[PDB]
């Protein structure tokens, strides 16, 4: 099997805006998670081809990763902060759906999600 194309990251047919919450999600949330010791499995789409996992995209039909989230934030793809937050949650849920609980990949996702929830609990009120 090939990999699927990555999720769409740009759409010139929908309106664009910048807000302080989206700025916070790119500059504080994404930046802090990206530099984490355990970020590297989530920084790009799961490469089922290189990792020889033929059933990954048979099980995971809504893939998401922090490289896509990065690109969507940079392209002003999100109108609402909640759209981005939902993408982060999809990434974590995909990991918990596919991977063995208590094993290395899941432990790494849990560490990132804890940090994610801490930063989101400090999401600034709309400017
Ligand atoms: C968020 N990532 C994610 O959800 N994933 C899906 C499942 C997965 C991944 C890896 N990773 C990730 C870490 C790097 C890695 C490296 C190799 C590898 C082996 N040799 N070389 C040169 C590299 C392999 C291997 F499967 F090919 C797998 C993986 N494992 N699993 C499964 C875990 C259950 O058990 C079977 C493998 C990603």
CA distances from 65 to 2, 8, 34 (A): 18, 12, 11
Experimental method: X-ray
Q: Tell me the structure's resolution in angstroms, rounded to a single decimal.
A: 1.7
Q: In the chain, what are the domains?
A: 19-123 (1.20.920.10)
Ligand 1 pocket check: which of 51, 62, 110 to mutate, most ligand atoms within 8 Å of Cβ? 51
Determine if ligand 1 sits within 6 Å of the CB of residue 66. Answer: no
Secondary structure in 3-state letters for the chain: CCCCCCCCCCCCCCCCCCCHHHHHHHHHHHHHHHCCCCCHHHCCCCCHHHHCCCCHHHHCCCCCCHHHHHHHHHCCCCCCHHHHHHHHHHHHHHHHHHCCCCCHHHHHHHHHHHHHHHHHCCCCCCC
Determine if ligand 1 sits within 6 Å of the CB of residue 46. Answer: yes
Nearest CA to ligand 1 atom 20: 51
Determine if ligand 1 sits within 6 Å of the CB of residue 101. Answer: no
**Cβ atoms of residues 46 and 65 within 8 Å:** yes
Nearest CA to ligand 1 atom 38: 46
Determine if ligand 1 sits within 6 Å of the CB of residue 42. Answer: yes
Q: How far apart are CA 108 and CA 68, in angstroms?
A: 19
C-alpha neighbours within 13 Å on the C-beta side of residue 60: 26
Cα-Cα-Cα-Cα dihedral sign, residues 27, 40, 89, 45: positive
């Amino acid at each position: 099997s090939t990999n699927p194309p990555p999720p769409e990251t740009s759409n010139p047919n929908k309106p664009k805006r910048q807000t302080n919450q989206l700025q916070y999600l790119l500059r504080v949330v994404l930046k802090t998670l990206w530099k984490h010791q355990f970020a590297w499995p989530f920084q790009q789409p799961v490469d089922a081809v290189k990792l020889n996992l033929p059933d990954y995209y048979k099980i995971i039909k809504t893939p998401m990763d922090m490289g896509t989230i990065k690109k969507r934030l940079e392209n002003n793809y999100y109108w609402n902060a909640q759209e981005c937050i939902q993408d982060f949650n999809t990434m974590f849920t995909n990991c918990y759906i596919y991977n063995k609980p208590g094993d290395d990949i899941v432990l790494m996702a849990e560490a990132l999600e804890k940090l994610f929830l801490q930063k989101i609990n400090e999401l600034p009120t709309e400017e």
